[PDB]
Design a protein around this ligand. Structure first.
Ligand SMILES: NC(=O)c1ccc[n+]([C@@H]2O[C@H](COP(=O)([O-])OP(=O)(O)OC[C@H]3O[C@@H](n4cnc5c(N)ncnc54)[C@H](O)[C@@H]3O)[C@@H](O)[C@H]2O)c1
Ligand SMILES: NC(=O)c1ccc[n+]([C@@H]2O[C@H](COP(=O)([O-])OP(=O)(O)OC[C@H]3O[C@@H](n4cnc5c(N)ncnc54)[C@H](O)[C@@H]3O)[C@@H](O)[C@H]2O)c1
Ligand SMILES: NC(=O)c1ccc[n+]([C@@H]2O[C@H](COP(=O)([O-])OP(=O)(O)OC[C@H]3O[C@@H](n4cnc5c(N)ncnc54)[C@H](O)[C@@H]3O)[C@@H](O)[C@H]2O)c1
Ligand SMILES: NC(=O)c1ccc[n+]([C@@H]2O[C@H](COP(=O)([O-])OP(=O)(O)OC[C@H]3O[C@@H](n4cnc5c(N)ncnc54)[C@H](O)[C@@H]3O)[C@@H](O)[C@H]2O)c1
Ligand SMILES: NCC(=O)Nc1ccc2ccc(C(=O)c3ccc(F)c(O)c3)nc2c1
Ligand SMILES: NCC(=O)Nc1ccc2ccc(C(=O)c3ccc(F)c(O)c3)nc2c1
Ligand SMILES: NCC(=O)Nc1ccc2ccc(C(=O)c3ccc(F)c(O)c3)nc2c1
Ligand SMILES: NCC(=O)Nc1ccc2ccc(C(=O)c3ccc(F)c(O)c3)nc2c1
Ligand code: NA
Ligand code: NA
Ligand code: NA
Ligand code: NA
Lengths: 255, 255, 255, 255
């Protein structure tokens, strides 16, 4: 009952981290709108979970997002929390293999889609003293190899979270982000499957964490529910869900 | 029921943040041991809360802490979480007004008392795959005026949290800290009461936060319960409970 | 003679921070190419400084940047350092007053122009074991009010610096950024001139720093020369030139 | 001539990082006082370098430090910069192998010795608008394995730097720190020599840096000279000299 009577929109909610966050909010008593650009995962989740419904919506299409918000209000009467989870990590790319145009397209999903849904939802969040939760990445803060565009988009999301927190604090609307590290999702599986030795790449990923495993969507989901329902003095924070990967010295390559 | 069947020790649990953390864990289903060097607050809390009991213990006295741990095991059979909250902020002191000896004494409470209880408890935490929660401070990270010794002790606690997280991760024991900002407690009230204009000093404190108020012990308590009971992929993190005070530009004093 | 025999390109070098960085490198013995989209400041600087020359170039125009690099090599035979300083801060804008299209345009200057010149220059920097210096902002790290797009662009530049540092470290090319705080430049003057009380706005800006003044272009310039010429074990760092504005509590707005 | 006419005290100046910093300041035109508790390195450096002199002084002995300051003034007439470099890293120690008393002793050197010389020197630094430079460590910020006491002492030094910067900014005295990563010094050599496979331990240390080597005392020295002589808008900063070890994912140990 931690978030009973509340209404939550989760973008990219059809699989992976997004689906874990959907399940965490339903388990807390909330009604959830699943936004995804793909029908398959999200429609099945709608049938599985009483309290969850699916709305097809590509967050890079402004008119899809407008409809997403107006249907959430029409069907449920309020809006309390937006979770900006939709995003993509391209396959590893050397810097000279990137293009300005590929970079713009990635900014369009990972940064501007978050911006657009946040903007269209804030009027309703102000009425409910609701809150925004953005899913950034640890690599926005510490960097990552062969991912200059991805890393730059997540640096922007984390910084944007802090700016918007400042602007919305007079209106009682909190704005926070979660920076996951290696979480085991279908995207992680798909990227590993492209590599010469998928299993070695997955072993590498597990051991980047002092805890020796990757994280789960449910753990990101629990962090989200905490920010929504219990972190009433937290705004502009970056909550790390990484298993300790940012800690200590490692293998990154006498004087 | 989030932490039902679990056993928690909270130091400095007799008032303020500590008492808020006690109440949050009892509300989550846990049995709580209240450690304090003063009898008055903690003994009343024992009578108020079924599931909480009080043990007199000065965390700077190694034999007090040994007894604290051995009695917790004798009375309850396990130990799942230690919350190192006991600590002190001296009145504002200019750097030339401090002494090496006053600095050592403050290190004794704010740093070594945390170290000692953590050390004596870890054998039992390893058996339970338990966890450690240290209460540091935002000012360890950003600094504070007229508090060189205090600030240095909290910088040490935050760094120590990360080192210990590294060492204990192979054994499944998580180690995290919470860095509160301005929280309204009897210590805050006592320091304000020493100033020329107490009410102006309290107004200043409220407005250091974008949210325009100070935080509450219950909010620190909710953050603690989250780290204990739900943050299973978090270790070595610093969870900010500050109301946004670290964000943006302020008044800190053409080219 | 700290950077004698070296060749440096500075974007936005015609006034402000950029012109200060130009002067610092000429004073260190280097030959400098001044890139700017406006002729007036940069052409005068060319006549003033032996060792500096001016090339008209809009960093958002890919063919301008290609020509910038190919002329630097044709005229001087090598390229040792690129300083990505060109950028803009819009007037203060509430979040609901921003647009996706204005945000894209700002990303085009502050982020993609840096990306494009870095990309076209890296082949030559690899040959010289040269280095990249990006001019980000403190507000990328701590946020700023009424500047969601600006803040997001500088968060991206700081994160991008760390990713590129990773990728270029095997080739001996260092990549670092400087995050200035309030520096007194014609842009600062222009923004203050838009406000109801320009002088009060400038007083506010000075007092956001513990040092009680704003910074100077020459101080950013000295930091740049240090990174280029002497910081041979520094890569991926963010060098703060802020006067302490990120330190301590301030005025950002009982429990 | 960058620091000509200036007078600098360097603690632990007899070898390693300290000796590198001594040489960097002499090369910049300054007169340097070498403080060390051991005679051998520092006395030879006095004979080697015109402009450097040696004063035996254990920074944990308050009366040694008082004499250090009063002799610097008596012999040279002013004091412009203090570099708090003296410090120690114990051999790797598991947390249950540490003691409260060993922890206190390490705090005495790495933290309180810095505090004491800073305190006795500040009157003279105020007269000269001088500055303080503390040598902390990257591991204060990111943690390190088997070094809970060491890590906590450096967390304290970095935080103390920011607090003191705040307090001294009205008087025009800047206070900054350098956080080196793996630097190749006699202490590094001595610790490696204790390990089962010294050469493997040294290879590990080199590859913790994206740059693939350890740093040199001269590079820390150049960073020090920059902070003293050219970073007039920098206070309370932490200048990383680490070769990128804090960047990206590494080896720190499916969901
Ligand atoms: N997996 C990790 O290790 C990891 C780590 C850090 C951050 N993240 C972030 O977490 C988020 C989710 O990652 P994931 O691993 O679960 O990914 P995923 O690919 O497994 O699932 C992402 C979901 O978002 C949807 N989506 C993609 N583009 C969309 C669009 N334009 N409109 C609507 N929905 C869209 C997909 O259809 C999919 O259902 C992303 O923002 C990612 O950057 C992931
Ligand atoms: N109040 C704030 O704004 C704030 C902000 C940041 C951090 N903190 C930290 O939070 C913690 C609690 O602060 P608070 O404001 O509630 O303080 P408080 O003074 O109101 O209460 C602290 C409690 O700890 C007890 N205590 C003190 N010394 C002890 C010892 N040696 N052994 C056992 N118990 C001891 C006291 O008796 C008291 O019951 C401290 O570690 C403090 O540094 C507080
Ligand atoms: N002034 C500050 O307080 C401050 C603080 C933090 C960061 N910064 C950053 O420092 C940099 C310089 O700022 P400033 O205050 O000197 O600004 P400024 O406006 O005074 O000068 C910027 C220069 O860049 C040029 N420029 C703009 N767009 C360009 C383009 N497309 N191509 C080429 N040149 C272009 C302008 O013509 C001008 O000569 C910017 O990146 C800014 O974000 C400034
Ligand atoms: N070597 C590294 O990788 C590294 C990395 C990060 C930080 N550091 C820090 O750099 C500093 C210097 O380290 P180093 O590797 O050159 O060490 P080092 O052992 O090689 O030399 C340190 C010097 O300090 C002197 N010293 C020790 N105790 C003293 C005391 N009580 N009074 C006066 N002098 C004293 C020693 O006699 C010696 O000459 C230390 O503060 C250390 O924590 C070193
Ligand atoms: N270039 C070496 C190399 O094998 N890189 C690889 C290989 C496989 C991966 C699988 C998934 C992810 C991923 O999406 C990801 C990971 C961490 C993040 F913090 C984050 O935001 C995203 N990254 C991978 C990176
Ligand atoms: N020197 C100006 C001045 O009036 N300072 C003052 C005045 C009154 C205070 C009342 C309480 C506290 C306090 O305990 C505290 C605050 C914030 C922290 F992050 C933290 O760890 C502790 N600090 C105060 C600081
Ligand atoms: N919304 C209150 C309000 O008066 N804001 C204002 C008013 C005037 C300014 C003048 C200039 C700047 C500026 O360009 C700037 C400053 C700091 C940065 F770290 C940075 O990257 C850029 N910012 C200003 C911000
Ligand atoms: N426990 C594994 C293990 O072999 N650790 C080891 C082994 C050998 C070392 C040699 C020297 C140093 C050292 O003094 C040091 C290094 C980095 C720092 F940022 C810093 O402040 C200090 N640390 C070492 C750590
Ligand atoms: Na349903
Ligand atoms: Na009870
Ligand atoms: Na010229
Ligand atoms: Na000499």
């Amino acid at each position: 009952t931690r978030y009973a009577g509340k209404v939550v929109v989760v973008t990219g909610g059809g699989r992976g981290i997004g689906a874990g966050i959907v399940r965490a909010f339903v388990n807390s008593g909330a009604r959830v709108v699943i936004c995804d650009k793909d029908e398959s995962g999200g429609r099945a989740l709608e049938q599985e979970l009483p309290g969850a419904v699916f709305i097809l919506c590509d967050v890079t299409q402004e008119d899809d997002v407008k409809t997403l918000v107006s249907e959430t209000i029409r069907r449920f009467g309020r809006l309390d929390c937006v979770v900006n989870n939709a995003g993509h990590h391209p396959p590893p790319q050397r810097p000279e293999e990137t293009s300005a145009q590929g970079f713009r397209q990635l900014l369009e999903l990972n940064l501007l889609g978050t911006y657009t849904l946040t903007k269209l939802a804030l009027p309703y969040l102000r009425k409910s003293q609701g809150n925004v939760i953005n899913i950034s990445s640890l690599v926005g803060a510490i960097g990552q190899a062969q991912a200059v565009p991805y890393v730059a988009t997540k640096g922007a999301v984390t910084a944007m979270t802090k700016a918007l927190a400042l602007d919305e604090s007079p209106y009682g609307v909190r704005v926070n982000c979660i920076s996951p590290g290696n979480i085991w999702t279908p995207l992680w599986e798909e990227l590993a499957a492209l590599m010469p030795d998928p299993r070695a790449t997955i072993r590498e990923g597990m051991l980047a964490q002092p805890l020796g495993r990757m994280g789960q969507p449910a753990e990101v989901g629990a962090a989200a529910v905490f920010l929504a329902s219990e972190a009433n003095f937290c705004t502009g924070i970056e909550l790390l869900v990484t298993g300790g990967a940012e800690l200590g010295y490692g293998c990154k390559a006498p004087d």
